Amino acid sequence: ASLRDIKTRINATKKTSQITKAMEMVSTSKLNRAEQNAKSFVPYMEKIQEVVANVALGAGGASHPMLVSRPVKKTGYLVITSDRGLAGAYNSNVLRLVYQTIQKRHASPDEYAIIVIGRVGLSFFRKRNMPVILDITRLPDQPSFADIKEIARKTVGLFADGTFDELYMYYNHYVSAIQQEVTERKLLPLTDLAENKQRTVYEFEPSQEEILDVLLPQYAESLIYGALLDAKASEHAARMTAMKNATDNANELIRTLTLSYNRARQAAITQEITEIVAGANAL
């Protein structure tokens, strides 16, 4: 019967709406913790940025290869994507921009490499047969530094060993609950470095060569960690927005179905009463 079919559709849509509302609330709860992590990470990054700004320029010349460009033979690309989908365009924008840039500026068969963070990115680059060197998945909803320290160290070592001469990273930047832009950063080698107004000089022990050789990998790892935190926050915000939109659509579908349910109910009552009266009159 049409009445029972409409009732079943309404029940299914209500269940979907409830599930989406639960997902939205969970996403907001996780976004709070992501923002807390982003707030917590600030002082270490600020201190290391001040130290590197003081030491790398003004205190001496380019004593390390990571401070000076070299002729390009290979490029490293680091992409951060969510392990689970169900977020609006969050992974799609990053993957599309990365693929477009690769095809339109690069992509000789052996001219690049990909570092993938996320099952979505893994599946994308495996399906499109894009070569991948390093891999990491199943990261926690609030990743810690020890989780990605190994992969960041491996990336830094691969760059330092001359496997590729420049490294780029792509991720979603968090602005508000609505805006998540895709940002591109030339991570290596340290082409741009801001000036620090303190201008403090320490007595280097030993000379600045080892100081820089120890400091630079930590700076790169900190930058990677900050990008990862921003990407996690953007993912949570995008999931929240998508779930809210899904709930609104479900509610609209529910009311449009209730109208038809009322119409079918009236039709059924009319038909039943007409049949009963006709049967009575037949006698």
Binding site: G85, A87, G88, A89, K127, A242, A246, N249, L253
Partner: protein, 119 residues
């Protein structure tokens, strides 16, 4: 009359493929309405992309409708129809906007309309 031994093997295959892709597009409608295009798999995006163009190309301008719109109308042979739908199914015209397929007729009119629009 829609049988392989009557209309031809190519005609039958093209019709069956068109019906299959239209059925898949119809099935995806509830998910499209609830979540949107973002949650479809990679091949479902292609299915929707082809199905919308096929549905629009199924339309036609009529000779009797000229007095109400000014469009002269068209008479499309079955061979031309089959060739155009096969070309659409093969992905030859995936770049053209879907509005170019609206009320043209032959497959070349789609290209002419898109070029006039500025593609």
């Amino acid at each position: 009359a829609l049988a392989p031994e009557i209309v031809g093997e190519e005609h039958y295959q093209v019709a069956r493929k068109v019906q299959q892709t239209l059925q898949r597009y119809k099935e995806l409608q509830d998910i499209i309405a609830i979540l949107g295009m973002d949650e479809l798999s990679d091949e479902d995006k292609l299915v929707v992309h082809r199905a919308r163009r096929i549905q629009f190309f199924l339309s036609q301008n009529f000779h009797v409708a000229e007095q109400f719109t000014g469009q002269p109308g068209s008479y499309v042979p079955v061979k031309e129809t089959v060739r155009g739908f096969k070309e659409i199914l093969e992905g030859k015209y995936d770049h053209l906007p879907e509005d170019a397929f609206r009320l043209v007729g032959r497959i070349e009119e789609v290209v002419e309309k898109a070029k006039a629009m500025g593609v």
